[PDB]
Amino acid sequence: SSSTKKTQLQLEHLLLDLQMILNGINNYKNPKLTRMLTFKFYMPKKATELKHLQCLEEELKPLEEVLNLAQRPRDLISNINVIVLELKGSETTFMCEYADETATIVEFLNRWITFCQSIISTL
Ligand SMILES: COC(=O)[C@H](Cc1ccc(C#Cc2ccccc2)cc1)NC(=O)C[C@H]1CCCN(C(=N)N)C1
């Protein structure tokens, strides 16, 4: 169908966005980089379905905050939330369960990139 292709493209949109953020870190200078890597993110116990994207949405402000510190962030984050909403819908309710261990921004992005890739692969 073309509804499934819509979902694929939205996931690819989210994935590229997250990948662009990750790639940007490679240029940050040490003082900045060192500080930025001590800012913790919460990781979901489980993220294998679209509804789990809520656990990424919840961590979007913290993502925006740390990114403002290291620089338009408001615009990119808002675009990610728009895609997140389009992908999961607002009808599904879900309560995020986070692991005990928090993660760096690099680990947080890698996990959500893997997530996007994973859903793509199933369709
Ligand atoms: C008790 O809180 C902490 O130990 C540090 C503290 C912190 C704050 C800001 C920074 C920074 C920076 C930075 C980045 C780039 C350039 C210059 C400075 C680093 C560590 N903060 C964090 O771990 C971020 C998380 C705090 C709790 C809630 N939140 C979350 N992921 N839900 C974010």
UniProtKB/Swiss-Prot annotation:
Keywords of this entry? Adaptive immunity, Chromosomal rearrangement, Cytokine, Disulfide bond, Glycoprotein, Growth factor, Immunity, Pharmaceutical, Proto-oncogene, Secreted, Signal
What processes in GO biological process is this protein linked to? activated T cell proliferation; adaptive immune response; cell adhesion; cell surface receptor signaling pathway via STAT; cell-cell signaling; extrinsic apoptotic signaling pathway in absence of ligand; immune response; interleukin-2-mediated signaling pathway
Gene Ontology MF terms in the entry: carbohydrate binding; cytokine activity; glycosphingolipid binding; growth factor activity; interleukin-2 receptor binding; kappa-type opioid receptor binding; kinase activator activity
Where are the disulfide bridges? 55-96
Q: Where in the cell is it found?
A: Secreted
Gene Ontology cellular component? Answer: extracellular region; extracellular space
Q: Which disease is it linked to?
A: A chromosomal aberration involving IL2 is found in a form of T-cell acute lymphoblastic leukemia (T-ALL). Translocation t(4;16)(q26;p13) with involves TNFRSF17.
Q: What family is this?
A: Belongs to the IL-2 family.
Q: What does this protein do?
A: Cytokine produced by activated CD4-positive helper T-cells and to a lesser extend activated CD8-positive T-cells and natural killer (NK) cells that plays pivotal roles in the immune response and tolerance. Binds to a receptor complex composed of either the high-affinity trimeric IL-2R (IL2RA/CD25, IL2RB/CD122 and IL2RG/CD132) or the low-affinity dimeric IL-2R (IL2RB and IL2RG). Interaction with the receptor leads to oligomerization and conformation changes in the IL-2R subunits resulting in downstream signaling starting with phosphorylation of JAK1 and JAK3.
Quote the protein name from its UniProt record. Answer: Interleukin-2
* Gene that encodes it: IL2
What stretch of the parent protein is included here?
Answer: 24 to 152 of 153
